[PDB]
């Protein structure tokens, strides 16, 4: 289906909804480990490529 595979989250971040595959146009909200806060736009979004 050539969607998006799971991205590696940034340091001290994690995926709210870890999956094998994310749909085109689907956005994944990262979140920060117990000691950390998110700064910036915490969503990656699956592009058609």
């Amino acid at each position: 289906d050539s969607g998006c595979p799971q991205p590696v989250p940034p340091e001290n971040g994690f995926i709210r909804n870890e999956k094998q595959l994310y749909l085109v146009g689907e956005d994944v909200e990262i979140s920060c480990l117990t000691g950390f806060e998110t700064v910036g736009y915490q969503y990656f979004r699956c592009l058609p490529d």
């Binding site: 994690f14 709210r16 085109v24 979140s31 480990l33 736009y41 969503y43 058609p48």
Partner: protein, 1245 residues
């Protein structure tokens, strides 16, 4: 085997279609009746339709039943019905066959008014809406708009009254993503039909003239690799040659028709003159490649040529460019394939063959020689080779034709067709080998038709006449043959054809009725009873029916003119043979010129309508069954044949200045004449309309109308101008007078623009038939849209033209993004039903610019839901195994409590009517009794023991604390006693490295407790269980020191779970931490280990679970190994539910619902309680994620903005531009589920 039947039906039943099903019986004499019926599958309980059909000699024992699967009578729901039973019943037979059904009923032709749009435009769009019958569908329909990133942007839905669905004009969002947008159209509710259309969003400007680049070939071969030749021409959009342009040629290498940017050339970079509309160019590809590149030979050049061309009009300000994105260098220039060729032999009858020679760019080569080698076998491998025939292709179609008068004994033909252009070697002459096979009758019994493979299509309403010849050992039995005529998937005609006394059979003398006008198909058959064995014999053929509409709506400009003046009052007469609706549109031909590589909106409409043909190829087949399958039919017969062997494979054989206006819908009561004034745009307008009637759709002939004037001005204002910059603006005046004369244009502009000209002029004379360049140098002070007229005051008077300048801010356009997930239940924890976004202002705003802002809410769907539930055994778990010693009372009641809470999830009182409702009061009573019992076992010191005089058990006390944590959901236990029990348990047994080591209780009651891996550090188990019990108690007895002991125990449990030990320990520890810090890094690392230990079935996991200790051994009954298995899996389930990882949990729930190891666990209390806890928590989290949220977004100081009714249906409100300069507060009602919303802020620096 004399008494036989055929019922023949479409290969697939379309939902709601009227399907015509036809029955023939053979060798009966007494007039008898049958019923044909459609019934639910597999149960045959529900008749979707039935038809009584009388069969008699009077009918030649033939009839059809018309049967329809009404869409509402299907059960629908989560699972579409895939299959259905067709049934026949008579005095003499009954049989039923499983038909597939499909919901793909009808067509959704999306028409947008234009192929491309700029930002700050709106796309007027409408859909034509038809059944599988060509009647107007009258079905309510939803458009789904999709951006170039694939995000859904809007759903808009309309009720069809007409077959024309005029949707609301979709304003392009206040910041579009560029590129190809998509629209998908679906009927609501009950059909799968999906229309699709596209449009590109770009900052385009209307081209002033077309540039056409015209290579002689889309390939270069041996002949042209030395040198290639390529014409260029250009015309103004009023269809007159561009008199003079400077042409600059920019060749490049290419490798891929799809996309590449291979090295652009820097040699033979020809600059040349276009004259009288044409430039002729040539390219010595050999010289250019050898000079520029390290490539030097066509052998190195299985590749492509790029060319771009740009042309500058030699006396004016309009300049235009175009490209050919690849001319294929290849030693084999052509490719070859068969067309309309059966690959099935009619022996003795002439076998025609047609073969098409095609470009490497998928285009017809035209005239080429071809030779066809042929080899035949008749019988017993008796092999003979035929003389190789030779032919040449048709100069337009590229189709060569052949025919072989094969032997009457021929059984197979294998034949090799090779291109015979002598200038190509055989390795480059496109050549192919093919095999064609006889009908392979069992009883040497065949059916052939005289159809002369007519290359011309049949003409509507003519009497077609096809002669048909059965041949068989038993011809004197056959007496007649049947025929079926197929249009789309549907049997539109049927009949029978008697043997004359001549032993000659009636031909198919039939009118090609108007329902056949899409290319149609014919199948003929008979059953012959043989000596005693019946055989079904059949054949089929393809019939092209020349595409004549039913309406044939003819529409013409009654004041016929070569060209109209701008603003000319015109009378457009539409005439139709009958009352018809019509849709009308006008679009500037220059807009089709805007798209580099244009296409029309309704090209190929008829071949799209023909997609409903279920058959393929020219006809014939390997067998009667294969003939029926390839015709797109299926059949029920006792005559020793069946379709079922053949797969449903996807057979693929080949057989004022507006940009648009007049966008209107009208009734034409057979005729209506509509008069209107054309726009002021001096261009050819492409006028198109579509008639819609009960007869079907008909796209009218496209009307091209030229708007022309002897003199005019046009100005090359770009799509937008940078604010605060002096610009050079270029135009040219065009003279089509016979003679030159003095012209001036006085420009006049709003004070928002200044120019050095400061307009009366020299009033230059343009010479006749010529254009003169005009240029102004202007600076726009102000953003947005600004008016500027031009008056071409020339001969004895004024002239008027008007334009709007578009002004864009300097520097960079910049943007930011921010957003949140709204969470009114705290599914992720922090309840987040409100947020605010300030009116943030960047550090370097371009001082006069304003920040554009666009909000974008997005729904989050539940996904898959699993109906994991308890059986009516919940009633046994209420009445459960006798209360008494061994605390069989505790074993009975604690399940009563957990069942209580499961039922308390609510479904099992509203819906449980399938089973006996658990009486609320009875459940309450039993609950109360268990509460009293559990109290009775409490130790005086608020410890617990099973034996009255037994030791305190920290384990069993934690189990009590868990259960009494559940009970409060309906009947609180007196919290004082709970608090005292907690204080006892922690104060007595909180060790400082591990905790709550168990006291000297005589034994765990093995069915009440469980066996942990006591061989190593059972303190891990005890700590986990005590933690879990404390967790379930704390909310009813929050205590700071209990919190501290929790922290300690969690820390020890983490640090001592870093070695994996045994996976039961890992799962129960992970669950304990899931109750604690859901998000600690090492917690997650433990989770990532557990998820590694999970076994799965299927590559996408259908089931997921964990095993240890060789539990892979079979066990017919629950046991301690299955107890450990179920426990560790249930703890992993509970952990994953704490993670809310439904996509991970679902296959675990499905596994657990199997009850593999039937009865489960040891059937211990522990496994059962953890399993039910997991099932309840799953059904809870499922109903939590159910999305319902009325998210109301508003400004802080200013009013409300929008109120998205976010629902499983309306799950995605459109993006809203945040106009007003204020802080934004987004809010929701308590609602349900999760959603996320984003604002983007767009600004200049």
């Amino acid at each position: 085997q004399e008494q036989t039947y055929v019922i023949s039906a479409p290969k697939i039943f379309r939902v709601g279609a009227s399907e015509n099903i036809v029955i023939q019986v053979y060798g009966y004499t007494e007039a008898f009746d049958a019923t044909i019926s459609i019934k639910s599958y597999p149960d045959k309980k529900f008749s979707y339709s039935s038809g009584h059909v009388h069969l008699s000699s009077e009918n030649k024992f033939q009839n059809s039943a018309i049967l329809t699967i009404q869409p509402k009578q299907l059960p629908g729901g989560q699972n579409p019905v895939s299959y259905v039973y067709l049934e026949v019943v008579s005095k003499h037979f009954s049989k039923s066959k499983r038909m597939p059904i499909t919901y793909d009923n009808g067509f959704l032709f999306i028409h947008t008014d234009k192929p491309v749009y700029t930002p700050d435009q709106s796309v007027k769009v409408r859909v034509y809406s038809l059944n599988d019958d060509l009647k107007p569908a009258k079905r309510e329909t939803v458009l789904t708009f999709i951006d170039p990133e694939g995000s859904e942007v809007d759903m808009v839905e309309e009720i069809d009254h007409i077959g024309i669905i005029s949707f609301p004009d979709f304003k392009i969002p206040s910041n579009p993503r560029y590129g190809m947008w998509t629209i998908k159209a679906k009927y609501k509710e009950d059909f799968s039909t999906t229309g699709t259309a596209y449009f590109e969003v770009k900052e385009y400007v209307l081209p002033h003239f077309s540039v056409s680049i015209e290579p002689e070939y889309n390939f270069i071969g041996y002949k042209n690799f030395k040198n290639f030749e390529i014409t260029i021409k250009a015309r103004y959009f009023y269809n007159k040659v561009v008199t003079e342009a400077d042409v600059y040629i920019t060749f490049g290498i290419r490798e891929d028709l799809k996309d590449d940017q291979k090295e652009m050339m820097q040699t033979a970079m020809q600059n040349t003159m276009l004259i009288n509309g044409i430039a002729q160019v040539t390219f010595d590809s050999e010289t250019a490649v050898k000079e520029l590149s390290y490539y030097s030979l066509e052998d190195l050049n299985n590749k492509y040529l790029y060319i771009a061309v740009t042309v500058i009009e030699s006396t004016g300000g309009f300049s235009e460019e175009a490209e050919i994105p690849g001319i294929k260098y290849v030693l084999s220039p052509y490719k070859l394939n068969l067309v309309a060729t059966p690959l099935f032999l009619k022996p003795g009858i002439p076998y025609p063959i047609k073969v098409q020679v095609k470009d490497s760019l998928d285009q017809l080569v035209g005239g080429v020689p071809v030779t066809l080698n042929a080899q035949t076998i008749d019988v017993n491998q008796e092999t003979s080779d035929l003389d190789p025939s030779k032919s040449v292709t048709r100069v337009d179609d590229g189709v060569a034709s052949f025919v072989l008068n094969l032997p009457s004994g021929v059984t197979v033909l294998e034949f090799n067709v090779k291109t015979d252009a002598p200038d190509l070697p055989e390795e480059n002459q496109a050549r192919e080998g093919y095999r064609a096979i006889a009908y392979s009758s069992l009883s040497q019994s065949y059916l052939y038709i005289d159809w002369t493979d007519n290359h011309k299509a049949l003409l509507v309403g003519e009497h077609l006449n096809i002669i048909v010849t059965p041949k068989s050992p038993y011809i004197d039995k056959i007496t007649h043959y049947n025929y079926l005529i197929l249009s789309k998937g549907k049997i539109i005609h049927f009949g029978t054809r008697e043997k004359f006394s001549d032993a000659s059979y009636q031909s198919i003398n039939i009118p090609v009725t108007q329902n056949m006008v899409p290319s149609s198909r014919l199948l003929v058959y008979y059953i012959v009873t043989g000596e005693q064995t019946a055989e079904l014999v059949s054949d089929s053929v393809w019939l092209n029916i020349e595409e004549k509409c039913g309406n044939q709506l003819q529409v013409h400009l009654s004041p016929d003119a070569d060209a109209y003046s701008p603003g000319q009052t015109v009378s457009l007469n539409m005439a139709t043979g009958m009352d018809s609706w019509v849709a009308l549109a006008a679009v500037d031909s220059a807009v089709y010129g805007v798209q580099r590589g244009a296409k029309k909106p309704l090209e190929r409409v008829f071949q799209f309508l023909e997609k409903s043909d279920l058959g393929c190829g020219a006809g014939g087949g390997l067998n009667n069954a294969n003939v029926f399958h390839l015709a797109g039919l299926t059949f029920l017969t006792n005559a020793n044949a069946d379709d079922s062997q053949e797969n449903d494979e996807p057979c693929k054989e080949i057989l004022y200045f507006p940009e648009s206006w007049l966008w209107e819908v009208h009734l034409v009561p057979r005729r209506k004449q509509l008069q209107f004034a054309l726009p002021d745009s001096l261009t050819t307008w492409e006028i198109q309309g579509v008639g819609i009637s009960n007869t079907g759709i008909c796209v009218a002939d496209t009307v091209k109308a030229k708007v022309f004037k002897d003199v005019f001005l046009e100005m090359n204002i770009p799509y937008s101008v940078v604010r605060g910059e002096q610009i050079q603006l270029k135009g040219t005046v065009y003279n089509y007078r016979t003679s030159g004369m003095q012209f001036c244009v006085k420009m006049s502009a709003v004070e928002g623009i200044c120019t050095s000209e400061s307009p009366k002029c020299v009033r230059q004379k343009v010479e006749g038939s010529s254009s003169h360049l005009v240029t102004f140098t202007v600076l726009p002070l102000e953003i947005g849209l600004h008016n500027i007229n031009f008056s071409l005051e020339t001969w004895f008077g004024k002239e008027i033209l008007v334009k709007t300048l578009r002004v864009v801010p300097e520097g960079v356009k910049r943007e930011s993004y921010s957003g949140v997930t709204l969470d009114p239940r705290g599914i992720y924890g922090t309840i987040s039903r409100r947020k605010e976004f300030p009116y943030r202002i960047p550090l370097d705003l371009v001082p006069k610019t304003e920040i554009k802002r666009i909000l974008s809410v997005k729904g989050l769907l539940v996904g898959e839901i699993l109906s994991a539930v308890l059986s009516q055994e919940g009633i046994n778990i209420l009445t459960h195994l006798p209360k008494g010693s061994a605390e069989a009372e505790l074993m009975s009641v604690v399940p009563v409590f957990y069942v209580f809470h499961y039922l308390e999830t609510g479904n099992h009182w509203n819906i449980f009517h399938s089973d006996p409702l658990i009486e609320k009061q009875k459940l309450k009573k039993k609950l109360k009794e268990g509460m009293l019992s559990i109290m009775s076992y409490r130790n005086a010191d608020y410890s617990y023991s099973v034996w009255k005089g037994g030791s305190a058990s920290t384990w069993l006390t934690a189990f009590a604390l868990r259960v009494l944590g559940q009970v409060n959901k309906y009947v609180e236990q007196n919290q004082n006693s709970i608090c005292n029990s907690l204080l006892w348990l922690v104060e007595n047994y909180q060790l400082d490295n591990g905790s709550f080591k168990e006291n000297s209780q005589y034994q765990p009651i093995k069915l009440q407790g469980t066996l942990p891996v006591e061989a190593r550090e059972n303190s891990l188990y005890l700590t986990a269980f005590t933690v879990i019990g404390i967790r379930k108690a704390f909310d009813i007895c929050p205590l700071v020191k209990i919190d501290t002991a929790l922290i300690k125990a969690d820390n020890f449990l983490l640090e001592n779970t870093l070695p994996a030990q045994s996976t039961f320990t890992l799962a129960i520890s992970a669950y304990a931490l899931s109750l604690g810090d859901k998000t600690h890094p090492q917690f997650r690392s433990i989770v990532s280990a557990l998820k590694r230990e999970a076994l799965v079935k299927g590559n996408p996991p259908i089931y997921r679970f964990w095993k240890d200790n060789l539990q892979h051994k079979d066990s017919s009954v629950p046991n301690t190994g299955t107890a450990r298995m179920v426990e560790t899996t249930a703890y992993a389930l509970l952990t994953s539910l704490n993670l809310k990882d439904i996509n991970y949990v679902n296959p675990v729930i499905k596994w657990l619902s199997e009850e593999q190891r039937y009865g489960g666990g040891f059937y211990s209390t522990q496994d059962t309680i953890n399993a039910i806890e997991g099932l309840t928590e799953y059904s809870l989290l499922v109903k939590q994620l159910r999305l319902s949220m009325d998210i109301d977004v508003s400004y802080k100081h200013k009013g409300a903005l929008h109120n998205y009714k976010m629902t499983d249906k309306n799950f995605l409100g459109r993006p809203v531009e945040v106009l007003l300069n204020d802080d934004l507060i987004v809010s929701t009602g308590f609602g349900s589920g999760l959603a996320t919303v984003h604002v983007t802020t767009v600004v200049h620096k």
